[PDB]
Amino acid sequence: NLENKTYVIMGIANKRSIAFGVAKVLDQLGAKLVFTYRKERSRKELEKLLEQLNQPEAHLYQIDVQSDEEVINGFEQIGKDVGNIDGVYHSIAFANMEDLRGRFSETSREGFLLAQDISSYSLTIVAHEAKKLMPEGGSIVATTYLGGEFAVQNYNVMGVAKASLEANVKYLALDLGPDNIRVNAISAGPIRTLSAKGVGGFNTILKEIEERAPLKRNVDQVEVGKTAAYLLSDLSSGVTGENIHVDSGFHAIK
Amino acid sequence: NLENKTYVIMGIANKRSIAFGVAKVLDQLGAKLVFTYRKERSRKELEKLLEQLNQPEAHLYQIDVQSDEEVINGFEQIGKDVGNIDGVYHSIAFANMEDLRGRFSETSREGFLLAQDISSYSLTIVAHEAKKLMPEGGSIVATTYLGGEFAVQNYNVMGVAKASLEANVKYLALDLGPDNIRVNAISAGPIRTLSAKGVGGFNTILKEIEERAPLKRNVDQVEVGKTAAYLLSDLSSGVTGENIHVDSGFHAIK
Amino acid sequence: VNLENKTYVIMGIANKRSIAFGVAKVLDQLGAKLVFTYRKERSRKELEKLLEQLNQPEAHLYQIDVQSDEEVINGFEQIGKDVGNIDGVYHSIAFANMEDLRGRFSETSREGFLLAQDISSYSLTIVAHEAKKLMPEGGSIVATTYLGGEFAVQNYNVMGVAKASLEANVKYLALDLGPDNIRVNAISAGPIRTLSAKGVGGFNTILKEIEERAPLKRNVDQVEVGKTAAYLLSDLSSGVTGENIHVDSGFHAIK
Amino acid sequence: NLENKTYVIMGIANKRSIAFGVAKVLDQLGAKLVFTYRKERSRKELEKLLEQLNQPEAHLYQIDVQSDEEVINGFEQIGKDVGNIDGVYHSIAFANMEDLRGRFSETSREGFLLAQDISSYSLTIVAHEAKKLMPEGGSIVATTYLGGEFAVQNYNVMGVAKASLEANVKYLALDLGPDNIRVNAISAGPIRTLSAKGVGGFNTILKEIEERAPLKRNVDQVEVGKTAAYLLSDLSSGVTGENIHVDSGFHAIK
Ligand SMILES: NC(=O)C1=CN([C@@H]2O[C@H](COP(=O)(O)OP(=O)(O)OC[C@H]3O[C@@H](n4cnc5c(N)ncnc54)[C@H](OP(=O)(O)O)[C@@H]3O)[C@@H](O)[C@H]2O)C=CC1
Ligand SMILES: NC(=O)C1=CN([C@@H]2O[C@H](COP(=O)(O)OP(=O)(O)OC[C@H]3O[C@@H](n4cnc5c(N)ncnc54)[C@H](OP(=O)(O)O)[C@@H]3O)[C@@H](O)[C@H]2O)C=CC1
Ligand SMILES: NC(=O)C1=CN([C@@H]2O[C@H](COP(=O)(O)OP(=O)(O)OC[C@H]3O[C@@H](n4cnc5c(N)ncnc54)[C@H](OP(=O)(O)O)[C@@H]3O)[C@@H](O)[C@H]2O)C=CC1
Ligand SMILES: NC(=O)C1=CN([C@@H]2O[C@H](COP(=O)(O)OP(=O)(O)OC[C@H]3O[C@@H](n4cnc5c(N)ncnc54)[C@H](OP(=O)(O)O)[C@@H]3O)[C@@H](O)[C@H]2O)C=CC1
Numbered sequence A, B, D: 001n002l003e004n005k006t007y008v009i010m011g012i013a014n015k016r017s018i019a020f021g022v023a024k025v026l027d028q029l030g031a032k033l034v035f036t037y038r039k040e041r042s043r044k045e046l047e048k049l050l051e052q053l054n055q056p057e058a059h060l061y062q063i064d065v066q067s068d069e070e071v072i073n074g075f076e077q078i079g080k081d082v083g084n085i086d087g088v089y090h091s092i093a094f095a096n097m098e099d100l101r102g103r104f105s106e107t108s109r110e111g112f113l114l115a116q117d118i119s120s121y122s123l124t125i126v127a128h129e130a131k132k133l134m135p136e137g138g139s140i141v142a143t144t145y146l147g148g149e150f151a152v153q154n155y156n157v158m159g160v161a162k163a164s165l166e167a168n169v170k171y172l173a174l175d176l177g178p179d180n181i182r183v184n185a186i187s188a189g190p191i192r193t194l195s196a197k198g199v200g201g202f203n204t205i206l207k208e209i210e211e212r213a214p215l216k217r218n219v220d221q222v223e224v225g226k227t228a229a230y231l232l233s234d235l236s237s238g239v240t241g242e243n244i245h246v247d248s249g250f251h252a253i254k
Numbered sequence C: 001v002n003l004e005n006k007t008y009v010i011m012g013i014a015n016k017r018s019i020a021f022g023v024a025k026v027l028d029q030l031g032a033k034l035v036f037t038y039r040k041e042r043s044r045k046e047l048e049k050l051l052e053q054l055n056q057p058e059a060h061l062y063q064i065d066v067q068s069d070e071e072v073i074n075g076f077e078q079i080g081k082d083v084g085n086i087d088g089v090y091h092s093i094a095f096a097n098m099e100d101l102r103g104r105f106s107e108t109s110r111e112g113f114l115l116a117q118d119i120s121s122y123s124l125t126i127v128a129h130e131a132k133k134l135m136p137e138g139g140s141i142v143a144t145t146y147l148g149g150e151f152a153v154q155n156y157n158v159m160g161v162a163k164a165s166l167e168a169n170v171k172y173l174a175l176d177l178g179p180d181n182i183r184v185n186a187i188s189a190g191p192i193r194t195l196s197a198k199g200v201g202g203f204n205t206i207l208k209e210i211e212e213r214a215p216l217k218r219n220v221d222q223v224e225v226g227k228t229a230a231y232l233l234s235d236l237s238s239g240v241t242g243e244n245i246h247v248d249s250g251f252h253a254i255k
């Protein structure tokens, strides 16, 4: 029951974004929501998508995580429009496509530092800024993948980028824990999102999950969302620095 | 909302038990509850505590998990008496005092196997019999300690038993996954229960947690129960074979 | 590595395909004196025949059924009398009933479960307590594990719970015996066609998977375990305790 | 016995370096060694460390790993001067102290990506260029710290770089496995080296080891070299993507 609660959701591109699953679940549970976006596709788009929700008013902010200025000013503006918040759902990453379908040993320095910047550092800077709006504490969640933990074929540079995120979570949880702010991750199983298009060896995973994972099925964005409701609410008080696998138990098998 | 849900809670001994933390939370949420005990002692207790709960009917069953008969015939009586359930909270462990204050290399064989019997194997037989009452699926949750992943001073044989329980949870997960039974653990941080009582200076991993955990506090039974409610309900739906730490972040640090 | 003037007790040779034998060949190649324990008479006969491949001028065989306190106690006492102090122990011993491996994991009998815990895990503890007595300046104790102790592996079942138990056992003994300069470590060998795999479903299909999916594209063998064991058992690993080395062509590190 | 073997060693600063402990071990075992340095300071130092060693006409090379070209041309010059190698020991990382002095949440973007650059990607590019000189296969090892796996107090942005490194080592292992190149990490305990010199959190942990690690002592650079020699040799064939902890058992307790 999330009435009276306010969350910022970052990383909705369209109806298939993991973050849209998050949105729908907190909306249903009565949370006030705030959204951020990178460009103008996610802009008109988002507006249309929020007609699916039950938000009295549309708080959207253009934040590109590569600018410190846009993250600092963006969160400050959110503060001025909606007051204090109770949490942030981080759902932002990027790797160059070429770096995923070539050999990991061939990853450019640019492609590598690029994926670090967007997929991992974003969360540090966003967490420093969002902290200003959480005086009595709150909850930050980020979205990761098992490739951060073990080497998965063709995940490559994004795997290194998610290992970095998952350690980010750990260091943020210990830094902000005394300020009563919890920092956790959701390691989601593979889902058919926009970024999932044209990635090498992706749709073979969906299949292998079906055959091998304890639950013999794949997950969906609404499943990630539910666990997100958990991590973002007081139900998870006491739980921080953690990584919850919403993945049909694929993580627990070899 | 867990109305129209029924859960079996194993291992309330008194007001301070971890399992009563779980009970309160789930009762609050409208669930029906079924309780099991070992001792006569823990029964007159169970009856008393029920007065603090919204349970119009006391359903209590004596099950000593050392007995195959008592576990088969107990779950069979639950099922006649109440019907299908939605899952099971397993909060049962034991080790001889004598072995935990000795050096781990001095542990008696009988001590070691008995801790294994009650703390790990009991979940396996419990799962197999509880599955009988879960035709459409459900969720099984066991309680562990960080001493099962890493060597914790003085936890000794119980750590080994907890390691075996975490593995057991993984194998059960993969076995009972195609039956839509999810199996998970909560790794509780230290708590002042009737069990903590004996261990000397147990007060000092207690103090250590205050000083060093990210949240700089110790967790409570109700915080366990809140995470339990997540795992036992449809909220945790894509999560199985997982070990969630309700220990204020203690596991993410060194 | 130079193991001359060093002495090691090797537990769990049963035939020429035993992982403990790949261990024995290598330590022998490096100049170590070796002492052997066996359970079945059939294994003692094997050991006799097998020395003939080794350069062990004196043949030391001891019957130790690790189910028995008395047998472990007396066995290690007799070893002290007969050969004196030792530099480490290789433990290469496990058991699980075949009924429990063919059933679903949920169906495992209590008896099978506890027998698996007793022999595959508890025996490292008693072994370490009595071995320690022969190591007053310290030494190195090594056990063998398998990845199904860390992740649920299909068909490995009760044994997986057993290896999980052993792997914690290694950590608690490392912590307990550290102050006595005794290091305790495990090797997670990849799957190897021993006498003990022979019966087992799931085995032939994991082997193939390793070849196909593990970073090195091949399966490992008993000598490779042996080599890593010489590192663990020697001063080459003087800083290493409570550690689990996967000798498995990198299959642990992928998904 | 690494007779007839050739190894490139990167990151000797002084006689207290970890990489020099490695060098002494490998030199004792009769291996050929190549050195790389950034600062001429470190060259001067190398030049005189050599008298301790039994190398005939030692080859020293400046490689600042922040530079693509110094690294390609560096290894290209090494294949020319001495031909094929059998291995690389990577002992290189950097983080600004002002990132480390502050709370982790205040970490500059710049300081994060530089850490990543120097401490993590430097491995990827090095691997790719050293592959060239290891046609029949070989062995690559790098140096991490337990702060890569867990949040260690004050380790801050380096913990995130080391996490990244650890992932890199795995993903290099899977891409490079088929070309018979093994890739591994050593997780060293704290040692008083040149780069330990300004750092907060160092005495704290160094003392906790003595009191808490199983061996109740801290480790030293030669103990690291011994494990380096194992992984860089045929003794560890079948071992890849692994992180060996040379830290008196500290990694294994909690
Ligand atoms: N799909 C899957 O199977 C899995 C996904 N994940 C993770 O979950 C998260 C959600 O991604 P997903 O829904 O899959 O796909 P999407 O492509 O829907 O969402 C990714 C979002 O990241 C945004 N983004 C990228 N770069 C920046 C930037 N510099 N500043 C701001 N926003 C940026 C994109 O914005 P824009 O579109 O405006 O360019 C987009 O909205 C990611 O972190 C992903 O790694 C984890 C496990 C598996
Ligand atoms: N206390 C703590 O700080 C922590 C505890 N844990 C774990 O939490 C769980 C509950 O612990 P906790 O509440 O602390 O202590 P409690 O003493 O409250 O609960 C232990 C329960 O185990 C029951 N039990 C013991 N042996 C048997 C048996 N043979 N058959 C049936 N039931 C049996 C006891 O019943 P009876 O009293 O009637 O014999 C009792 O109800 C255990 O798994 C424990 O290891 C995990 C992390 C930390
Ligand atoms: N084979 C594989 O693929 C892998 C094996 N392992 C592990 O490696 C170790 C060696 O297995 P492996 O060599 O493959 O098979 P083996 O059968 O060759 O060796 C197992 C040994 O255990 C002994 N043993 C069994 N019960 C007892 C007992 N009560 N007392 C004393 N010794 C006993 C057997 O001797 P006896 O017959 O005389 O009783 C035999 O020597 C085991 O720990 C196994 O779990 C780990 C990873 C993979
Ligand atoms: N000291 C410790 O307690 C521990 C150290 N480690 C790791 O061991 C490794 C070695 O460090 P350590 O021996 O402690 O101390 P050192 O200062 O002796 O070694 C660090 C080396 O990295 C080199 N280096 C730094 N930046 C660059 C660059 N831009 N290009 C090329 N080389 C560079 C330095 O060379 P130059 O001076 O010429 O710029 C220096 O030789 C590091 O990865 C460190 O994180 C791991 C665990 C604990």
Ligand SMILES: Cc1c(N)cccc1Cn1ccc(OCCc2cccs2)cc1=O
Residues within 6 Å of the ligand: A093, A094, A095, A096, A097, A100, A145, A152, A153, A154, A155, A158, A190, A191, A195, A196, A199, A200, A201, A202, A205
């Ligand atoms: C944002 C982004 C970009 N720029 C490129 C590739 C992937 C992604 C997001 N994404 C999408 C799918 C995903 O699936 C994990 C399963 C896979 C395994 C190997 C390749 S994909 C993980 C994942 O992180």
Ligand SMILES: Cc1c(N)cccc1Cn1ccc(OCCc2cccs2)cc1=O
Residues within 6 Å of the ligand: B093, B094, B095, B096, B145, B147, B152, B153, B154, B155, B158, B189, B190, B191, B195, B196, B199, B202, B205
């Ligand atoms: C059921 C039981 C029995 N019979 C004996 C000892 C312990 C327990 C339960 N318990 C109790 C306390 C606990 O504390 C975790 C912190 C500790 C570390 C070392 C000793 S206590 C963990 C834990 O598992």
Ligand SMILES: Cc1c(N)cccc1Cn1ccc(OCCc2cccs2)cc1=O
Residues within 6 Å of the ligand: C094, C095, C096, C097, C146, C153, C154, C155, C156, C159, C190, C191, C192, C194, C196, C197, C200, C201, C202, C203, C206
């Ligand atoms: C000593 C013993 C007994 N008594 C019963 C089962 C297995 C073993 C030995 N063994 C043999 C093979 C092995 O292979 C690991 C690969 C597998 C995966 C699933 C089933 S086997 C591991 C392993 O432990």
Ligand SMILES: Cc1c(N)cccc1Cn1ccc(OCCc2cccs2)cc1=O
Residues within 6 Å of the ligand: D092, D093, D094, D095, D096, D145, D152, D153, D154, D155, D158, D189, D190, D191, D195, D196, D199, D200, D201, D202, D205
């Ligand atoms: C190369 C570098 C730079 N530039 C800055 C800080 C540290 C280091 C190297 N280093 C040095 C010491 C060390 O000690 C680990 C123990 C600690 C724990 C918390 C703080 S230090 C680990 C470690 O990685």
